[PDB]
Symmetry: D2
Subunit: 445 residues, 4 copies
């Protein structure tokens, strides 16, 4: 027909329909077939999407994730659904059940972590619950009573075990932990990953998404899977990873998210009278990781750089992660204006060929840009949501509104795509992606 777009009520209805369709009972899959398990930072965004629909079920999603938390406080990036195949690497390949002393009992999980967006989801649940009356507030408050300690142990694990030199940046041992699997950010670190005798495997992801231009290459997957072998060889021991891992990077976007999450969780702790020692620690980490992000920044543009710990070199790339300081604050006034100018100008949101005024995952003017290839170019609704929410929290009400308006216009086809081609708007990756529906529901719920 003359316009395939849905009205706001039709789109909200379809988004909620999707999220309930991806519910296995106590966990929501990240997508129906491509990602048929619970991913950690996806579960946070799913809980945000569920909060306008059912505070009780949003709380269940976070409870299920936190029940898979490791003994040392790490939240693993995948919690596998029982008896579910069609995703590789599955639990057999990770072997955390047999090898990892800290793995949970009676959950199957991966052995790496992912960004700490969870406190943001807790804030959204509390904000919805407070509009819904007493029994709903009681549900959310009982969740805090039950899980405050687990959330603290999660933030403490990050601060103590992935920032062992108190530099205020999080070290990753796998690009998957960044959430941006094949970002140009990691190319030079991955070039220093040399697989040994890698056990044979067959990919599953590109059986579902068959267009090779939309997913990482076989050579990249070989490196992803080899890092798993290096972790397995030391039984996922935190104390041994710095000595054996071929990939060790400080992720400045993860670090900025953690700064925000600490500040958010500290404000929740004050509001709900959690222990003062915990609130103090959270504000201290918020400050430390804010400073750690600012320390990376370009002196002209304010752009944030990742750091290769093995090579001891700043990683300079032109991706959306450069805008990490906008999330957590801390740049001097003049440099933050330069960074906003970069965000809005012809290298990113202002590029003249963009269909929507949204942030591409890699700058279209970078030689690394590929308009279809996962994190090397496409526009991701999940990132649009996170930037809009963080911008509103900075006080940039109009910038946040414009991102939401363009993100809703992009989503109004109802495909709920994982990511979109930046110039044509073609939906790419998995359709029926839960956190894309969640973004739409929060923007409308």
């Amino acid at each position: 027909p003359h316009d395939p777009s849905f009205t706001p009520t039709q789109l909200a209805a379809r988004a909620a329909y999707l999220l309930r369709g991806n519910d296995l009972g106590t966990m929501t899959t990240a997508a129906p077939l491509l990602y048929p398990h619970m991913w950690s930072w996806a579960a946070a965004f799913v809980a945000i999407g569920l909060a306008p629909l059912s505070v009780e079920r949003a709380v269940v999603e976070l409870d299920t994730l936190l029940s898979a938390q490791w003994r040392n406080g790490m939240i693993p990036h995948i919690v596998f659904a029982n008896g579910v195949d069609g995703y590789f690497p599955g639990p057999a390949r990770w072997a955390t059940a047999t090898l990892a002393d800290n793995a949970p009992r009676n959950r199957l999980t991966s052995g790496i972590t992912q960004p700490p967006v969870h406190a943001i989801a807790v804030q959204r649940i509390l904000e919805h619950a407070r509009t819904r009356g007493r029994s709903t507030r009681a549900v959310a408050e009982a969740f805090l009573d039950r899980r405050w300690g687990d959330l603290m142990r999660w933030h403490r694990w990050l601060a103590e075990c992935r920032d062992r030199n108190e530099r205020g940046r999080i070290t990753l041992y796998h690009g998957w932990e960044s959430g941006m699997d094949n970002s140009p950010r990691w190319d030079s670190a991955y070039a220093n990953v040399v697989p040994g005798k890698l056990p044979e495997y067959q990919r599953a992801d590109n059986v579902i998404i068959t267009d090779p231009s939309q997913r990482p290459s076989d050579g990249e997957y070989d490196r992803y899977l080899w890092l798993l072998e290096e972790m397995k060889a030391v039984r996922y021991d935190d104390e041994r990873l710095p000595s054996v891992m071929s990939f060790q990077v400080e992720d400045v976007f993860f670090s900025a998210i953690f700064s925000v999450a600490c500040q958010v969780l500290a404000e929740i702790g004050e509001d709900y009278k959690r222990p003062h020692a915990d609130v103090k620690d959270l504000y201290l980490w918020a400050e430390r990781f804010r400073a750690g992000v600012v320390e990376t920044t370009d002196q002209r543009t304010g752009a944030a750089r990742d750091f290769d710990v093995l090579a001891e070199k700043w990683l300079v790339t032109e991706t959306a992660a450069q805008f990490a300081p906008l999330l957590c604050g801390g740049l001097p006034h003049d440099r933050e204006r330069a960074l906003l100018k970069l965000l809005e100008g012809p290298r990113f949101c202002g590029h003249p060929d963009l269909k929507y005024g949204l942030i591409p995952s890699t700058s279209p003017v970078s030689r690394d840009f590929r308009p279809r290839e996962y994190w090397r170019g496409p526009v991701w609704p999940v990132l649009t949501w996170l930037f809009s929410w963080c911008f509103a929290r900075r006080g940039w009400a109009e910038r946040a509104r414009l991102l939401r308006q363009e993100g809703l216009r992009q989503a109004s086809d109802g495909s709920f795509a994982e990511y979109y081609e930046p110039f044509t708007g073609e939906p790419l990756g998995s359709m029926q992606q839960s956190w894309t529906a969640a973004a739409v529901l929060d923007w409308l719920g």
Copy 2:
């Protein structure tokens, strides 16, 4: 908080969330616990609610119902879910699998029928599909190819087997077939039902809805269950029911719905080039049942009367079924103006104590009125939807709009109640009622 109501997008999202939550896979329950099976006219309204969400799944709902159609064309009023308890009378009590020569193989069903709203759901599916493009139109058109014959056999069974004297009104052998179980319409016919040796039973419905003021009495249930015994004794044989049934009424509201449904299905048959003989028969029945409804009407107010076939007497009651002629048309101009005056005045929608400008199931000024008791007074969103849709089809655009606006205001608490107290707006009956969510979604989808 200061206002518990939801915005239109929040309400649409919650309605879709509910309908997906009630999906068992290929059938949607009418409610989560009170009605944990598929009801026939509920399934039509569920398909209307699904159409803005998934034309494919809306079609599946009707396919599942039609797969339970009896050999003689009857659509039974319940299709039981496999292995589901907590509803009485269940399939053991009906014993149609063992006793009824016309019962379907490999579905379990009841042995009575319910109103033919199904063609209306087919129209809504086609209207949505035509806005959605080629592959979606193909899905809806393939449904017509597959099920046109079954829909014809359903309408033919009603016309030939429940109007055996071609009076243009449908005979019922159970008040449950009217959809209005305990309506005052049936009280005098039920007083002539005398149970014999009624096999012991324990109700299940009032274990879920425990407030006795909201459900029928034990004495009424004894009569409902005795009629089942009379049908079982003749093995549900259509030819034997007139000779043995203690309850035989002509239902003028069912008759008007059938008139509309025949006209709707005839227009679909013309549009999609179905056999001309079928379209002709449908228009003939549309006309016959329109005239049959008009024949019942009060010469002053236009109000339609049911007919007790055993007592040979017009049943004069003050319920929403009086407005049957407004659905199908056919009254002379002056009498239809009088009937609209009755609808809008102080006996119904204009009653000064009503919270919303909606049609109570029984007039608040009738001595039969009970403000909590199922069909004896409460406002039913399903009836608001049906009247609004039929009124729009009469060309009464503003009257239809006002019913929709008030029905949405009533529903904006998000309880999706089965029915509502007419004066206080208190939600009553089952919460999470699928056809209440469907009404909201159609009004917004």
Copy 3:
């Protein structure tokens, strides 16, 4: 930027801002500069646009128009604003104040008429007023008390003086009376208009709209002005016009509007207890003009034809006026289905190059089609509104809704254009056109 469209709330605000900006006090101009006076059928649409904003001011608009009614009941098509120039032909050219015995005192008007959409405006005012409470209902009821007789005299002058032979169609003496000045409908009748010594003149309309492709030609204006000379020569006397006018046509679209308007006014008359004889006359005229419209129609396609009274021949053209019978009803069932098939097919709303699913003023496949030239092709929001309102009144709820949706999409640029290029959507004619803002306000009010 990326999306120059307005939200529904922004668009409704800017539509109301425009209408109040075109208010001279007691009359609203049809456009700020091109049409700086009150046009008769524009005033009806303006009152519809004002009814959601102020029932009182909506009533004032019709009061002002009726205060300019001629002594014989004719509503003239222009009521000039005092002292305003820049429109031609102005009141000096018409000279009705000096020549026309029936012209109003102390108003200046044109000497021809225009379609009777006024009763539709009265219906919308009453519907709004009934939602606004006792004081607002009193305003609208006082208007009926004060103006019912003038409305009757208007309808009676059309029925008796423009249908002298009781054929059930309205005769026009000028194409301006049709509202479709340069429609292909009138080309063969204008070809027989041979101007004599025409007093010199300078056009004003193409000083404001300078693009010559958007307005009638100079040769066309010469014929328009020559017909004025013929009417002036007989002092605008109804009895003498049939003997002298070079242009005499029966307008089937005007006739169908009149049928609808008579039926609408009759129902208002019944509801507000107006004299029985008036109501009976209105129903008589509604039927007469419904039959008159049907008599013009092609027996296979249903398309309605105009009639050239001087040439005694049916005018066969491919414009939107062919769909006149859809407005008033009366066609046999098969013929109306055929006419709907024409409307929805590739000659009109289904043409593959149309930007919107809307009714072009002339079929894009006609040899007469010109995509920019006034009534020879462009899409007119005022027609979209009239068709969608009449369709909803026929019971065609989905058809009406689709026209409304597409009309709002087209209007969402906020130009409030007089008409739009059918392929590109370019706004054409005057911007800030009052009845385009009124359509938008009604569709959202």
Copy 4:
């Protein structure tokens, strides 16, 4: 009827209709009859309401106000419409044209000032203009070119002449300059104002608002008018006012607005490349007045106090002005949490009897509270708007959203009242108040 509320589109339409109706040509009256002139801070809010409708007309509103700026930079609080009477005190009473050396030529104005919300209006105009494309941006940029210097002179006159001692707070010589004429804030200072021989007068305000409970008392008006006599006696000379005025107070709410406005104007200055010295002065003033506001605050609760310069004492009252520090920032973290707890608790937004979750002008638990009496208790939409905008700018997105939602709920009756009874929601003061329509338009525009 059952729901006298308007839909968002109807409400936006009626708000725009009202604003255009209050337009005299180049100035908008604050209300049709009670306030038939241009008020200074009302004009800022009016320009905000016009920006979604016409950036050009929004700019004209500020141009007209600035054309009335005094020679020393003061923006007077009233610009009188030519020839308009029915407001008292009018221009003959002020006699600024004859007495005040700095009064404008060929404009008539008052002789006192009002809060500097103008920069906020400029920000909203620019944000709208940037969404509307090149021509509209040029309009708004031309305004900056033409008026940047006048805006600087306005801020510099406040900073240098109303903060002579560089305390970072604005001194007022009349309670009218606060915008909160009869606030309890000023009661102890007015108690020391002893009128001498006051030239006789007749109030006009209580001929329009006759209910005495809604307006200030006669004794209060005598003091207001006596202060005028004191200013006239010294010819409105800035240098002489501190020696003669019986009323001299530092207004912490005005001061916080000024801080915000300086920061807003500085950011505009940086974005549009205005002189570096101006931007540096604006940042200096923003900090000075932020610190000045913080210096007034209770160390436990954060509540800000006004200061009586003549009595040399802090004015401790329980009004909405206590929340001044929330607008401008600067409080220590613990103190701001305490102040938010006061705002949200049972003394203000959390009071159990409030109809809406909105900020009453005086705490309902204060002995000074009067639920109908102007600034002594009622809820003012203009304050709701200002607080919600400032809160969003602080990053408090949910707090801002809740105020907007409740303000729209309250405004959904369409009265556009000046203020509302806090318990019953009764509209009070003038109906058709321009800045109430502006708030609604901004919240929906």
